[PDB]
Design an enzyme around this catalytic site. Sequence first.
Site, PDB file in Angstrom:
ATOM      1  N   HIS A   1      -3.157   6.545  -6.780  1.00  0.00           N
ATOM      2  CA  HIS A   1      -3.848   7.559  -5.948  1.00  0.00           C
ATOM      3  C   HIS A   1      -3.472   7.611  -4.354  1.00  0.00           C
ATOM      4  CE1 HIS A   1      -7.178   4.642  -4.885  1.00  0.00           C
ATOM      5  NE2 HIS A   1      -7.184   5.283  -3.714  1.00  0.00           N
TER       6      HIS A   1
ATOM      7  N   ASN B   1      -3.502  -5.493  14.205  1.00  0.00           N
ATOM      8  CA  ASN B   1      -4.048  -4.256  15.008  1.00  0.00           C
ATOM      9  C   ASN B   1      -2.917  -2.911  14.895  1.00  0.00           C
ATOM     10  OD1 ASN B   1      -4.770  -1.933  16.805  1.00  0.00           O
ATOM     11  ND2 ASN B   1      -5.911  -3.415  18.019  1.00  0.00           N
TER      12      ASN B   1
ATOM     13  N   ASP C   1     -17.940  -4.888   0.135  1.00  0.00           N
ATOM     14  CA  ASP C   1     -17.160  -4.324  -0.814  1.00  0.00           C
ATOM     15  C   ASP C   1     -15.929  -3.693   0.096  1.00  0.00           C
ATOM     16  OD1 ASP C   1     -16.279  -2.627  -3.099  1.00  0.00           O
ATOM     17  OD2 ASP C   1     -18.125  -1.078  -2.520  1.00  0.00           O
ATOM     18  N   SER C   2     -14.846  -3.342  -0.737  1.00  0.00           N
ATOM     19  CA  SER C   2     -14.093  -2.472  -0.169  1.00  0.00           C
ATOM     20  C   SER C   2     -14.345  -1.132   0.157  1.00  0.00           C
ATOM     21  CB  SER C   2     -12.578  -2.811  -0.870  1.00  0.00           C
ATOM     22  OG  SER C   2     -12.867  -2.229  -2.120  1.00  0.00           O
TER      23      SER C   2
ATOM     24  N   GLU D   1       5.503  -6.733  13.603  1.00  0.00           N
ATOM     25  CA  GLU D   1       5.880  -5.678  12.723  1.00  0.00           C
ATOM     26  C   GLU D   1       6.994  -5.530  12.163  1.00  0.00           C
ATOM     27  OE1 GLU D   1       4.404  -5.490  15.970  1.00  0.00           O
ATOM     28  OE2 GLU D   1       2.359  -4.592  15.819  1.00  0.00           O
TER      29      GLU D   1
ATOM     30  N   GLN E   1     -13.097   3.232   1.418  1.00  0.00           N
ATOM     31  CA  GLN E   1     -12.196   4.139   1.902  1.00  0.00           C
ATOM     32  C   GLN E   1     -11.177   3.582   2.811  1.00  0.00           C
ATOM     33  OE1 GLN E   1     -15.567   5.562   1.076  1.00  0.00           O
ATOM     34  NE2 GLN E   1     -14.769   6.152  -0.828  1.00  0.00           N
ATOM     35  N   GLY E   2      -9.921   3.674   2.595  1.00  0.00           N
ATOM     36  CA  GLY E   2      -8.796   3.230   3.480  1.00  0.00           C
ATOM     37  C   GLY E   2      -8.146   2.126   3.464  1.00  0.00           C
TER      38      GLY E   2
ATOM     39  N   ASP F   1      -3.838   2.989 -12.142  1.00  0.00           N
ATOM     40  CA  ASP F   1      -3.991   3.183 -10.798  1.00  0.00           C
ATOM     41  C   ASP F   1      -3.138   2.264  -9.990  1.00  0.00           C
ATOM     42  OD1 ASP F   1      -4.357   4.620  -8.459  1.00  0.00           O
ATOM     43  OD2 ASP F   1      -6.442   3.807  -7.946  1.00  0.00           O
TER      44      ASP F   1
ATOM     45  N   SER G   1      -7.935   1.427  -0.182  1.00  0.00           N
ATOM     46  CA  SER G   1      -7.351   1.860  -1.311  1.00  0.00           C
ATOM     47  C   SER G   1      -5.718   1.338  -1.311  1.00  0.00           C
ATOM     48  CB  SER G   1      -7.161   3.474  -1.271  1.00  0.00           C
ATOM     49  OG  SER G   1      -8.323   3.773  -1.563  1.00  0.00           O
ATOM     50  N   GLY G   2      -5.242   0.818  -2.517  1.00  0.00           N
ATOM     51  CA  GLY G   2      -4.030   0.461  -2.621  1.00  0.00           C
ATOM     52  C   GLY G   2      -3.872  -0.956  -2.185  1.00  0.00           C
TER      53      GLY G   2
ATOM     54  N   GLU H   1       1.281  -6.478  10.319  1.00  0.00           N
ATOM     55  CA  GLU H   1       0.478  -5.697  11.124  1.00  0.00           C
ATOM     56  C   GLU H   1      -0.889  -6.533  11.241  1.00  0.00           C
ATOM     57  OE1 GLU H   1       0.618  -3.415  12.944  1.00  0.00           O
ATOM     58  OE2 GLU H   1       1.637  -1.511  12.219  1.00  0.00           O
TER      59      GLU H   1
ATOM     60  N   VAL I   1      -1.488  -1.143  17.875  1.00  0.00           N
ATOM     61  CA  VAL I   1      -1.132  -1.702  18.831  1.00  0.00           C
ATOM     62  C   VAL I   1       0.426  -2.200  18.397  1.00  0.00           C
ATOM     63  CG1 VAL I   1      -1.286  -3.311  20.841  1.00  0.00           C
ATOM     64  CG2 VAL I   1      -3.160  -2.166  20.105  1.00  0.00           C
TER      65      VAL I   1
HETATM   66 CA   LIG Z   1       0.604  -3.625  15.402  1.00  0.00          CA
END
Ligand SMILES: [Ca+2]
Length: 223
Positions: free
Chosen positions: A40, A54, A171-172, A62, A174-175, A84, A177-178, A52, A57
């Site tokens: 999804h 932050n 819980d987990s 990264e 929105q965002g 899914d 996801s995955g 990652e 920033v």
């Molecule tokens: Ca960063």
Amino acid sequence: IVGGYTCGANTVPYQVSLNSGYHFCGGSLINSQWVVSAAHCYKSGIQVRLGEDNINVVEGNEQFISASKSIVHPSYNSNTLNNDIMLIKLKSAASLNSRVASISLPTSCASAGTQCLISGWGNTKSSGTSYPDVLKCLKAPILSDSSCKSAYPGQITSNMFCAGYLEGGKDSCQGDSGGPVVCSGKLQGIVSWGSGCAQKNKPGVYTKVCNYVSWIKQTIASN
Ligand SMILES: [Ca+2]
């Protein structure tokens, strides 16, 4: 993640952010070239962001690598969220060291009661909205199939499991996801769906990764 804690920078080294101009989903690095996420979360033009903390920033660890190809599970159904899961190949291999690392695939499915770590940059509120910049974590148990089915009548397939807390508050969301659900150092789940976030009697629902290991391996071997 609602009711979790700040992970600490680069303490979850397999966690990735999928970016299309902005963070939109989590994912899990499973080798130098490949990320597991939710179907999804499919879209074109994904940049995978590894290392990652932050996400707003540049902090020094990264790696930003564009996807070369996305493969949604052949049997993904977007109405039911059955199957899914999606694989994403990186255009170049990530550099692996202790802050950017793959997570092992399971050799066996996990049981209800097992403790796991769920992580992501999703909403931290159960009512209303607040998105964190730094990675959030939640320790949560896998729930019995029977409790999961009772919570979501008619909706839980053999490719799903519930994890979290029936009392609500943790819980987990929105965002997230995955993103990963890791138990004893193995990727056992993918953040998939739920009714709201952190609601009483409505735990999180996760893709049951152990069912997909054969597909993942054979797909990587030929792509
Ligand atoms: Ca960063």
